[PDB]
Amino acid sequence: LSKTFLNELANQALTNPNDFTKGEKKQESFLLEYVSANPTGPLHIGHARGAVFGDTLTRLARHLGYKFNTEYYVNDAGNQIYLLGLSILLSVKESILHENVEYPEQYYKGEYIVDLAKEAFEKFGKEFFSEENIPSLADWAKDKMLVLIKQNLEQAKIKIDSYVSERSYYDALNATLESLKEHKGIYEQEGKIWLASSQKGDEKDRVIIREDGRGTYLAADIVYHKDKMSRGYGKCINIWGADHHGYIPRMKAAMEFLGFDSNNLEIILAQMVSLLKDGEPYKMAGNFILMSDVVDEIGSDALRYIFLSKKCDTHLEFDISDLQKEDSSNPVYYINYAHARIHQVFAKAGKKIDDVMKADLQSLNQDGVNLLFEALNLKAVLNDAFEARALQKIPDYLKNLAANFHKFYNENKVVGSANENDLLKLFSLVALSIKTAFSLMGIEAKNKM
């Protein structure tokens, strides 16, 4: 490899560190809709992989110069959020008002439900709490839960750019039906309006409008997707749970019956995650494991690492006891340790990264040149990771780069040596790749351990 050439690349990277590996403005634009959990509680742990994957995808797309929007769909219909209003009323009655109450077979319970009930009782007063005020309670509640969900996401360094309401699509149903008919996608049978999805590769035809006159969940989903796909984006991306694979053909069929090319709807499937502690499955104030509880225990960086660390449609198993170790087996520690080790050697040498810029890297041994190449190779990795949707290439890159750095620095004396500046400049570039790649994972690199 040409050290002269790589040194020039090193100089370009280090002169404008914030622009290192950033791509020029791209032509293809995207709309990602992800997470989209019901506003009826805090995020469960099963939402974490989709959330972590989507935010990393977003950060990566933006870094590479793609126009990339994010959106969350709020299932906030009165009929959807009624049970949440019901459940708060019931826990006001039993935990605050102390009466014996009838409980249905499906209801929301937990520490969050009793805290919100205490918030409800303080805001509305005792008088309010009757069956007629349930949807007034549910509206207030679902807004509080959406605030909760937003901060659940913020805890994991995730912000979504647009939250959209189901309720704002009640007027949009007719235009969907019409557009579907204009492509011969709908028909009446047995008092119901059906989508002819089996004419477009689905297993069987599907109900759009019930005999009741009401739209189905599928109808609502089609309406929303019609809006998303007619917004001018190059592609719409969804992240769905892997158990929703059978739902793909009916949605593609619907999009074809709306005049859209269904290849412009990309479905990414997020597979199940197994969390372990001490070899046993993770467990514990609720019947579900909360994303919040896991972030409380392991921290944000660990969540952002673990949930990105294996191919999205493959099963991920991780033991959280590994985060107690301070070696190769705790990759967040180990990668951060590489970055911190560089920061410390610069302090030991009494130098800033601008003092070593003038070095030309010509004295680097083969191990140093490999590490230099590896540092600069981030650009290739990031572009490849985006285009293949293989985000686990980012942790993989970082793992190997930290390993190789650590091994290099163990075997090479720096401060006081005749090529101190060459080695420091090398190190400054390794630190930059660690910091850059980590930031796209929503992790800030540590200067000190």
UniProtKB/Swiss-Prot annotation:
Motif ('HIGH' region) spans which residues?
Answer: 37-47
The molecular function GO annotations come to: arginine-tRNA ligase activity; ATP binding
As recorded in UniProt, its EC number(s) are 6.1.1.19
Where would you find this protein in the cell? Cytoplasm
* Name of the featured protein: Arginine--tRNA ligase
Q: Name one GO biological process term.
A: arginyl-tRNA aminoacylation
The signal peptide annotation in the UniProt record is none
PANTHER family per UniProt:
ARGININE--TRNA LIGASE, CYTOPLASMIC (PTHR11956:SF5), ARGINYL-TRNA SYNTHETASE (PTHR11956)
Location, primary (coarse class): cytoplasm
Residues that span the membrane, as ranges: none
UniProtKB keywords: Aminoacyl-tRNA synthetase, ATP-binding, Cytoplasm, Ligase, Nucleotide-binding, Protein biosynthesis
Answer yes or no on keyword Magnesium.
Answer: no
Similarity-based family: Belongs to the class-I aminoacyl-tRNA synthetase family.
Report which reactions are catalysed by this protein: tRNA(Arg) + L-arginine + ATP = L-arginyl-tRNA(Arg) + AMP + diphosphate
